[PDB]
Amino acid sequence: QISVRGLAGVENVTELKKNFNRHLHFTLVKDRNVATPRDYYFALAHTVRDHLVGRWIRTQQHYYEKDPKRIYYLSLEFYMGRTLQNTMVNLALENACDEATYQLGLDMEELEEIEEDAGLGNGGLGRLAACFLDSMATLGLAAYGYGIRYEFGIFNQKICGGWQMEEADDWLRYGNPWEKARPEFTLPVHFYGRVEHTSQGAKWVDTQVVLAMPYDTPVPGYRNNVVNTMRLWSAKAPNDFNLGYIQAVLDRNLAENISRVLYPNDNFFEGKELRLKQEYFVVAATLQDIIRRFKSSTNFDAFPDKVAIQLNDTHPSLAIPELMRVLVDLERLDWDKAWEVTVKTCAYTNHTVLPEALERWPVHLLETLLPRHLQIIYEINQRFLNRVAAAFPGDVDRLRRMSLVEEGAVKRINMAHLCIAGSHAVNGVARIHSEILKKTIFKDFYELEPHKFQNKTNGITPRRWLVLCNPGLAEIIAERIGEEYISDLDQLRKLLSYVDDEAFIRDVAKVKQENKLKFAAYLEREYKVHINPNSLFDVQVKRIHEYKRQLLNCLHVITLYNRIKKEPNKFVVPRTVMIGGKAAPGYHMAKMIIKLITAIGDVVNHDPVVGDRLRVIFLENYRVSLAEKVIPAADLSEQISTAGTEASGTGNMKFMLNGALTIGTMDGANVEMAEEAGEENFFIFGMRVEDVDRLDQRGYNAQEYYDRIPELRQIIEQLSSGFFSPKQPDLFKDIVNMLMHHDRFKVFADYEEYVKCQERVSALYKNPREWTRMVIRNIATSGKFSSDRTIAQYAREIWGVEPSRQRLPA
Amino acid sequence: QISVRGLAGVENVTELKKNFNRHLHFTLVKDRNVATPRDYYFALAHTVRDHLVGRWIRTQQHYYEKDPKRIYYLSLEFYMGRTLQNTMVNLALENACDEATYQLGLDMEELEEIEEDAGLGNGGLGRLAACFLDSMATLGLAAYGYGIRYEFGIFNQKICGGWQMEEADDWLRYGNPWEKARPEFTLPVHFYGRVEHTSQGAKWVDTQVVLAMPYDTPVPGYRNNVVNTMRLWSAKAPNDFNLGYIQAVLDRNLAENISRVLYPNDNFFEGKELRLKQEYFVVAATLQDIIRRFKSSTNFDAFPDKVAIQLNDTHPSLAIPELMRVLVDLERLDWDKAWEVTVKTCAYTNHTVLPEALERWPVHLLETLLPRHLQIIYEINQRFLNRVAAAFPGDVDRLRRMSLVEEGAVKRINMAHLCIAGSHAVNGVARIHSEILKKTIFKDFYELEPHKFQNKTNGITPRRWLVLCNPGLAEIIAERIGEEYISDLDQLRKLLSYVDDEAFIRDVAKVKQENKLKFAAYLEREYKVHINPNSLFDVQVKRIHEYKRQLLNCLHVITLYNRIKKEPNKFVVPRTVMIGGKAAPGYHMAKMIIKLITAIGDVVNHDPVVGDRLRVIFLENYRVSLAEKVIPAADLSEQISTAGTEASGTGNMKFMLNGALTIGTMDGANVEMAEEAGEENFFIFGMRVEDVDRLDQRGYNAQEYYDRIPELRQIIEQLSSGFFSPKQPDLFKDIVNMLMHHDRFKVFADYEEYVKCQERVSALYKNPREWTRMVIRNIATSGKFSSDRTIAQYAREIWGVEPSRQRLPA
Ligand SMILES: OC[C@H]1O[C@@H](c2nc(-c3ccccc3)cs2)[C@H](O)[C@@H](O)[C@@H]1O
Ligand SMILES: OC[C@H]1O[C@@H](c2nc(-c3ccccc3)cs2)[C@H](O)[C@@H](O)[C@@H]1O
Ligand SMILES: *Cc1c(COP(=O)(O)O)cnc(C)c1O
Ligand SMILES: *Cc1c(COP(=O)(O)O)cnc(C)c1O
């Protein structure tokens, strides 16, 4: 049909069709009279996977011959989403498969919708890992993702009576056709035990063994015939485990619990033992694999020339003491040499400054579970604090503040401190966030080791986030400037010369209108709900958090409702306000916010006077596959975190790429997005970081805003009095009470500037041609936000490897 | 190589080789430089499985068009063993695969040895289910095996310090290439809840849901292109199960425990709740499937014309009240009509008379777990006891003895009584066992319903138990009388005309000698142990039990040892005495017997005076794949159960087929084996059933035998004084004490006749030509013991269906 989906060669289509029917028969053991849509999806998945196999074997082969430096991306989260369409895009098979399926009387879009999301992540951090693997394969780096094959990913969100309910994400029920189990590469992981000191050094004995069994998933580069590996570990009991008989066999589940379930907290620390077991499990099995591959090329001087280990936040921080333990206790290197190797091998990406997200593990937990690692951590701290003392003699306060060990009723290990000490590079994830790291939480470490601190601004893969989810926009761009931009997103600047072209203005607005029609139809077919596709689609999708200020959006929505009621017969730009996101199951306030959003919908969507001028929709089960549908349908992106709270964000970039204008704070990557597009092409409002600091020094009094802003007072009085909860008058007292007395994120302080800026948005939407010219200015400057840029900067400035766009042979 | 392994067509071999290399590449994602023997086995398994797929789809198709009466074999056990060689035998692929593998530089025998046993059974009963599926497919019956896919089968047995240790049988670790998951046919199963009575009858409410997910394994007939289905259910939690969050997800393991592990008790009842859940789970999911298939042809009059359900012992007895519950509570049939349907549908095979094996479930358990089934069971009992009262007026004792409910401190349900009441046919498993059922434990039921009671003597599949395990013997037989005997084992009688042929005498003895060489080499390569292949191989393999009297064999072995020591320089026929079997993990005495066997080995195998004239070997981890090696290597079969304890046995038949002479009691199928071969061709000794009865009436005094038999007294004194346990003098006091004061199985009563009969065996072994002529007389009359005979009798006399040897089209 469209050109960026590749050729449908006659030979190619014939070949796909016979292999589809071979897999239906031999793989699925179905005839065509009993097959379901689900069987057809599996037959297609197996057929497309066959095109990966040759390239995967060849790539791993090439890396063995050439022996390049290897990159190990350690993450507890890989938010992959669906694999089938992404595989077709990257092998140029998409049109051939459409044609092949079409001639067997099937619709490929319908079969795509049957694939389960691999939801092995919470949000931004997990999805950054996924975008990174795609960019690493596209830039031909010998790169490996290492994590955990959770049996249950992020929970499925149902809404009942407007409340979040959680269901187990049983994503493996029907089987994963993309993974290959490698039980032959199974490795032991140790827990508990105690430390014996001998003549021959320290010895970790009386341990409990858990087996780590790897599953390999292919990661295809973009049309370069590179296929990298994502290796996820599964927990298996050894067969003598607990070995009356029956109970011993049943208790194997204790050990296999380690890989059972993803912790569903976004940007929050829960100090639970099962989580610490997850963190050690992925690190212990991974390091053993890294060292085995290295030894298959005595001498660890070359280890850092052949190995880079990137830590995705502190979650795999134990990689540092584990590498020491292997090099010191097992390889019998002296401490100083092993430490040199560790520091030149490891680099740490910090993703947050929120204090409740920083991993601070109680010592009693580490003492019981990893006794040797705690000894190594103490040894690291003593030697690190000896270097601080020498550089800053007499600064005892510095010593206490920089310690890896926090004093307190409970002693804790600050894993962030461990990561800075044990890494040659520490990066934040947007320029403003990396600056905040040097000015505030890591100021002491910066002053000791200024050379370690870098910025690597986040990005998104334009493969999944443009070609895959928005083929129509991809195509009109490819008509003007060719295909090459897909692996070189900076080429989108050429679109600035098309900003006064009537034809291109018409095409950009037509694609947006087609995406909205398609998404409005999708809402009706799966959730029986009537929306106006001529309305402005105002979209805030992201995890539910106080810092992300879904509540500020709520206040705007109630303001528009109250203005309509005051003056019913006045014209307003119609809006569909869509908010979506999961709350962590234990996060009471995040659950109340979801409930308030649906409570507002219940009132405004059934007010006859409102008409179709204002609709409030809660998008259920926001996940990667819903993001691929709603982000292309969006007109306004809501990026409204309190300045200095959102380290980067990446949703922001997805929307810029897809033809939505941004309303946002000078927070995270929003700052660089505005800088790339021009501030005049961005709906900037609210406090800067400096303004929030000034408010903090003085004291935030929310009462002051309630007394001065009648529009705001009316909303607070409505919430209190049960305007939005008639049956439970006081349902929202916790929300009012937080906004009035303990708002860490200063929602009222930004209210007035938010509403005025939202008026500036409505005014521009009234002029389609100028709205669309501003959209073109956004899409055309979005190139910086390619994860290809990000990964090339990691490779050159951290890992010491040259990216490459050269094809391997097919 | 040999003719009964089929043709190696040039096209055929080429085709196997390209498909082997396709699966190695696309299925296993290996090149030939990194593949292991295990990869090669998987590539072959997938290649051979591809030949099943067409036949499987076609067969299930044919059964839908023709709509024959369907047979449902309900068992908690299917002891399948390995599938690969059996699949090749039944599709005539064996020589083509040997040739194909040979030309790729691989040895097929080496790859076969890598397959794990599917050990989903304890012994005879589980293996009878497996032989039955093979015979049902060979006789073209529309037959289905229904059971449980246990994650862990019968434990792996290790010996440490001569003691049994148990290891988890993790048979699915590397994947099962033979099964196909059918998660689309997933069915709910209910537990707990309570019964509400309404206008519209009884209602089972507030239940806990567990999902039953079916896995299908193909069952190929012998060269008839029929492939039947074995469907095993797996337990899965529903996704709202327990649905703080983490613990809810972890607690899904409670529900999935149901299909986790096979109970490892052979011919013993353990009244545990998890076992009752296993029994209901397989019955509830199976009946729903049976009824769905039936409705896809209102009216249940025809149900028994379209459905036979065979109960494999009482383990699925709940099929009876479950079928009532479905027909009465859900289909709203009146009680009398539903009962007619149930009785004409169900038939019950009894496998034992040992009182400790009979399932007697406490009422409090059934009350809590299956409240409605208990109400239906009470209703069955009341109506059944009303028919007893009418036929035997005033016989109140009969009423108490025949009740389905046993009175006692704990009330119990006698599941055997439930099965007789609810079945149109009740069979035992050998003529003597079926006679004992009518004379003793079911005498009352026989007098009420004489027409229900049948014999169906057990059999073994000559495919696995001759062609597969003993190709050499298969071939010399096929040279004289052709191939046709393999599906018509009665044709073995033609071998009686070859009993004076020198050539055939030489060939029978040559095959036996080759099997012994091959098995002696196997002992050295896997367990570093030196045995004389010129010695008589005296073999007792079967589960470790008091009733099977491994201890009587021990007493003989110690007798031979003491005779050698008394007269060292006298000639004795050399023997390798091999005993093998697992003990139930909780069966203290069975574990002591294993320990005594190894204790005897420790003494006799290191006595210089003994030389290689007597070796005692404990065969570790006796299982189906070890039976395929040792049974063809055997000279003497030990079948020495106390008369009236072994219902049938089936090991006995395996050895008769494979050229071993039998030493045994007139117990079980031994009686019919002797009758077929002639008593003069059988080493018959010991009490008959009548003799044991006479001893019981009088009282068994073991002291009398100890006082009268000096040879026996010496052995008891050796055991007591620590001759066999120098470091623990009193290790065996429990064994001595049992033999002297509480021997239920009268080991001393048979001692003297056993030793004399063993002397008659040694004397015949001295004359190879007459030993071999007696072997030919055994093999040639073994036809009756084909499971093809057994299944044809079930089909004609119980199920009301005509077997068939007609090929389906390929
Ligand atoms: O860099 C990728 C994204 O990382 C997000 C972060 N996630 C976590 C996080 C902690 C624990 C468990 C899951 C997740 C901390 S910061 C940050 O909140 C986002 O601003 C940023 O865009
Ligand atoms: O008919 C097949 C065989 O059945 C054996 C039997 N197994 C059981 C048995 C009970 C519970 C769990 C497993 C097994 C009872 S009788 C009998 O003990 C054998 O004699 C007989 O040959
Ligand atoms: C990109 C993405 C995120 C991160 O969005 P932010 O707005 O940066 O928090 C979260 N969830 C999903 C499903 C995503 O695709
Ligand atoms: C046949 C068989 C049995 C049953 O043997 P008996 O001697 O009848 O108890 C037990 N185990 C295995 C592995 C078998 O193959």
mmCIF file of C-alpha atoms and ligand atoms in Angstrom, chain A residues 79 122-124 127 465 541-543 548 622-624 627 639 646 649-652 654, ligand 3:
data_model
loop_
_atom_site.group_PDB
_atom_site.id
_atom_site.type_symbol
_atom_site.label_atom_id
_atom_site.label_comp_id
_atom_site.label_asym_id
_atom_site.label_seq_id
_atom_site.Cartn_x
_atom_site.Cartn_y
_atom_site.Cartn_z
ATOM 1 C CA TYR A 79 8.993 -2.440 28.531
ATOM 2 C CA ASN A 122 6.423 0.334 34.878
ATOM 3 C CA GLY A 123 6.881 3.259 32.449
ATOM 4 C CA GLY A 124 9.623 5.635 31.301
ATOM 5 C CA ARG A 127 10.595 1.827 27.921
ATOM 6 C CA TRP A 465 7.197 5.764 17.688
ATOM 7 C CA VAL A 541 -0.857 9.697 29.538
ATOM 8 C CA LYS A 542 1.778 8.547 32.083
ATOM 9 C CA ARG A 543 1.835 6.765 35.474
ATOM 10 C CA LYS A 548 3.177 14.638 37.402
ATOM 11 C CA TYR A 622 -2.521 2.639 29.632
ATOM 12 C CA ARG A 623 0.356 0.487 28.290
ATOM 13 C CA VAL A 624 2.749 0.549 25.289
ATOM 14 C CA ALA A 627 0.328 4.647 23.583
ATOM 15 C CA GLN A 639 3.735 17.641 30.390
ATOM 16 C CA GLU A 646 10.490 14.953 36.041
ATOM 17 C CA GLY A 649 10.173 12.257 30.553
ATOM 18 C CA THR A 650 9.877 10.469 27.173
ATOM 19 C CA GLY A 651 6.110 10.624 26.483
ATOM 20 C CA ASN A 652 6.847 14.323 25.776
ATOM 21 C CA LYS A 654 6.651 10.723 21.509
HETATM 22 C C1 LIG C 3 6.754 6.436 27.012
HETATM 23 C C2 LIG C 3 5.907 5.788 28.029
HETATM 24 C C3 LIG C 3 5.916 6.186 29.379
HETATM 25 C C4 LIG C 3 6.745 7.323 29.900
HETATM 26 O O1 LIG C 3 5.939 8.524 29.766
HETATM 27 P P1 LIG C 3 6.245 9.838 30.635
HETATM 28 O O2 LIG C 3 5.167 10.770 30.152
HETATM 29 O O3 LIG C 3 7.684 10.249 30.266
HETATM 30 O O4 LIG C 3 6.072 9.469 32.087
HETATM 31 C C5 LIG C 3 5.103 5.520 30.251
HETATM 32 N N1 LIG C 3 4.306 4.505 29.875
HETATM 33 C C6 LIG C 3 4.302 4.082 28.616
HETATM 34 C C7 LIG C 3 3.394 2.958 28.253
HETATM 35 C C8 LIG C 3 5.083 4.711 27.653
HETATM 36 O O5 LIG C 3 5.017 4.259 26.368
#
